[PDB]
Amino acid sequence: KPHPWFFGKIPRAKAEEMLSKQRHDGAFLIRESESAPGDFSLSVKFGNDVQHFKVLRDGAGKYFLWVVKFNSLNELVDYHRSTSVSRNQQIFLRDIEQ
Template sequence: MAAALPDCYHGPMTKRECEEVLGRKNKDGAYLIRESESIQGALCLCVYKQKVVYTYRILQAHNGNYTLLTAGGLQETF
């Protein structure tokens, strides 16, 4: 039996739709998780701050752990 998805999960949604949803909230710290448009199987954590939506990709490793995609040269944390 699969675990229930959190309320913040919005499934397939474009970046533009995400920005509209979070923009309507107009609250720093508002966030949602959506499927990535550019990386199949990845998720995006989208966070609203000062009228800007910051997007962080969430990847699942082969062992089932999750990590945020990091900038080059930074150590990954699972």
């Protein structure tokens, strides 16, 4: 089955609009940024706001948010289902509901 979190190229505002209607904290999606070619962003619902994280890439081609690195978006997402996306707030990724 394809992943329910890959939304492709959707504007940041649309992502917020959609995530705001979600009922659970941690509801998220990965989108292709309009800020730069071939870049990804992670948008997550938390409380009454939507937080955005820029998916960084290093020289070897690994993805990362802070320090830990991943060989794919799939691994990054799966990791953050059990480990908080932030050290300051407890945010665990969970699939959106349709």
